[PDB]
Amino acid sequence: SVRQKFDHRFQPQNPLSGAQQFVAKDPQDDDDLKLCSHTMMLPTRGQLEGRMIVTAYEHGLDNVTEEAVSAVVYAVENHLKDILTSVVSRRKAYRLRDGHFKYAFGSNVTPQPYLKNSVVAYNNLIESPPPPPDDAEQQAALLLACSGDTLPASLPPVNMYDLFEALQVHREVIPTHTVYALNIERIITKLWHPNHEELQQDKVHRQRLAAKEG
Template sequence: MNDLKIAKRNLSDALGDNIKLYWANMKLWYRQKITKEEFDLEARRLLSDDNIHLHNEFLVTVLTRCQILSSESSEASKVKSSSLSSSTEKLTKKSKPPKKKKVLVRPTFENRFVPSDAMLKAPAVAMQVEESLDFCARSLFLPDPAMLHGRVFVTAWEWGIDNVSGATIPLIMHSVQHVLKNVISAVISRRSGYSVREGKFKHNMGVFMQLPSLRNQSRDRPHLEKSSSSTNMETPSGQYSVTRPDSETSEQCAVMQQATSGIPPTQKPVSTYDLLDALQVHPGVLASHTVSCAAVERTIVRLWHPDRDELHQDDIQRQRVAQQQEELMVL
C-alpha cells in the first residue's frame, strides 16, 4: 500500500489541477466508455513528456495491488480448506489399524546414477498476444475481486479517500449477488406461477397455475398457510427451523395441484423484454432511483441494434483511433 500511495502522490503532484480530469478519464476507462489507447492519449495530453512515466508506474502499481489482494483472498480460502482436511485426516488416522513395520534394505555402493536431460525442464517461450481488459459486459461473469479492487480504488480516490478496507470487496460481491437474485426472481415470477408462504415469501417457481373454478387453492397446501410454533425457535447455528410435511401430505398436494392445473403454455426463452417488464412492474427491486433509471435505459438500448451504415462509421472511427496511436508511437 505504501508503493500505491507514493505513486498516487507523485502523479497528483505532476497533474496539479488536472487530477480531477484524470480520475474522470480513468473512471470512463473502467466503465468501458473509452479504450485503453484513448485513456493513454488523454493522459499524454495532461502530462508532460518528462512526467508521462508516472502514469505508467501508477497503472502498474494499481494492477499489482489488485492481483495481490485477490491472491490473498484465495490463499485464505485454501488455508481454511487445508485445516479442515487435516482435521479429517487425523480422525481417519486414529481409526486405521497400526501398520506393520517395513523391512529395512541395506544400502549398496553400486553406481545407479542416470544423468537427466537438462532441456526437459527448460521453459517453453511462446509469443503471447496482448489481451485486453475483461469487462463484465464482455465476459458475462460477475466481477472478480481484482476488478472490484480497481474500481473501488478509483471511486475512493475520486472522492478524496486514500485507503480502502479489504472487507469492502466481499460485502460488495454479496450485495451484487443479492440484487441479481431479486431481479431474476422478479423476471421469473412475471412469466410463470409460483407459491407464496405467509403471504410474502415466494418459492416453488415455475409451477402451473391452478384453476380456481376447480378447487379452492387455500385448501391445497394448508401447511404453508400457517406457520407452526417451531418457526420462531432459533437453532444454535443461527437459523430458524421449519417443520416439513410428511411424504403422504406432499404426494396428495402434488396430485391435487396437477389435477387442478391447466395446460402449460409454451413460452419463449427469457429476453430483454421480460427484464424491462419486470423492472417497470417491480421498481422496488432496485432501491436506488439512479440505478433503476440506468438499468431501464440500458435495457431499452439493448432492444435496438445498429444498421450497416452505423457499423461502417464505427469501423472508420476505430481506424482513426488506431492511426492516431501509431503516430504517437512514432513520435
C-alpha cells in the first residue's frame, strides 16, 4: 500500500519555463536606458521614452503614442507618493475628512479623548459650519492644550525598519505580486542597527568632545 503513496502528490509548475528569451541587439552608445538605480533621480519624460520603446520592440510593436509616456510618468509619481503616505501614517497623527481623506500630518491637534474638556471641545471645534487672528490664536492654543502632549518627542529619520513594517501591514499599496515579493526580500537584507562596540565608541567620542569643550 505504501509504494503508491507519493505518486499523486502536487507538482508545482516551475515559474522559469515560461521565462522570456533575451535577444542581443547592436551595442550602440545612443541605445541606453538610465534605470533610476543608476541615476539617483526620477526619470524625466524623455528618458522614459527611450526604455519604453526598447521594451515595446521585444513585443513586436512600432512606437509609443506619446500620451502613454505622460500617463506612465504620472502613475509612477502617484505610486511613489502612495508608498510614502503608507510609511508616514505609522509615525504621525493626522486628520480625516469624509472618512478617508488624510491631510494634516503633523502631531498637533489630536485631542485626548478622556478629558471632559476634550469631549466638549471636540463637539464644537471639529464640526465647523461649512477667522479674526485673535480668535484663531486663542483656538489654536486651546487645541494644543487639549492634545495632552506636554513634552513632545521626535523620531530619527526614516530607516529600513519603518519601511519593512509599513509594507508588511498595509500591503494594498503594492497589489502586484512581482513587485512586492522581489523587493521585500531585498529590504530584509538591508536591516541594520549598531551593535555594542559601535555604541561604546560613540560613548568615547562623546567624552572626547565634551572634554575638548570642557
